[PDB]
């Protein structure tokens, strides 16, 4: 099993896996031009063994070898979706989904602000590093992934649930309420998340 976030983070500060750095450093290059990127997914035995691979010697395989660009969005995916708690710990599952179902506006980005500021470091870096990267992706004109589109596809990957296996009724609760959690937090300006960008 993949194991914790913190497993793939040193002291070395923003504590951000390589792997998502690469991935997003990958994406940027050759991705933004992409229709359906995050949505389209890539070949699952590509991305299996990329991901053994990178499980197996503990470094991040040559992404710019692969010639299908969803196979390193599916990775990425696949890398957070797969820890052995969400990038959005089960600490604060509840209290995410809480924050972003507030319908006065101050009070729910307040709410937010407050649950990104309870995530260990790891947690939080990692989050804002992939923030500013869905932003840049929602903005451009070729992808055709809107924030609300994003926040569909990345509600299973980063908020997950309250344990790693619910009961079948908690588990479809859960993913309808996944999406307002990743639209508010992209919402959340560049600003915000870039002031986390810091050296320890």
């Keep these: ?35 359906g990127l995050y949505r389209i997914s890539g070949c699952d035995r590509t991305v299996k063994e990329l991901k053994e691979k990178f499980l197996r010697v503990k470094t991040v395989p040559l992404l710019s070898k692969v010639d299908d660009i969803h196979a390193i969005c599916s990775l990425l995916k696949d890398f957070l979706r797969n820890l052995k708690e969400p990038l959005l710990t089960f600490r604060l599952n509840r209290a995410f989904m809480e924050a972003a179902e507030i319908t006065d ?49 990345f509600g299973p990957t980063i908020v997950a649930h309250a344990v790693p296996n619910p009961d079948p009724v908690t588990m479809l609760q859960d993913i309808k309420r996944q999406p307002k959690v990743v639209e508010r937090l992209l919402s959340l300006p560049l600003e915000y998340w870039s002031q986390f960008m810091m050296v320890e």
Excluded: W
């Design 1 to 35: 099993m993949e194991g914790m976030l913190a497993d793939f983070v040193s002291q070395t500060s923003p504590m951000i896996p390589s792997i998502v750095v690469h991935c997003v450093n990958e994406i940027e290059q050759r991705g933004l031009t992409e229709t």
């Design 105 to 153: 506006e101050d009070n729910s980005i307040a709410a937010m602000y407050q649950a990104v500021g309870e995530l260990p470091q790891a947690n939080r870096d990692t989050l804002a590093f992939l923030m500013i990267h869905l932003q840049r992706v929602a903005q451009s004109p070729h992808t055709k992934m809107d924030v609300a589109n994003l926040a569909k596809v």
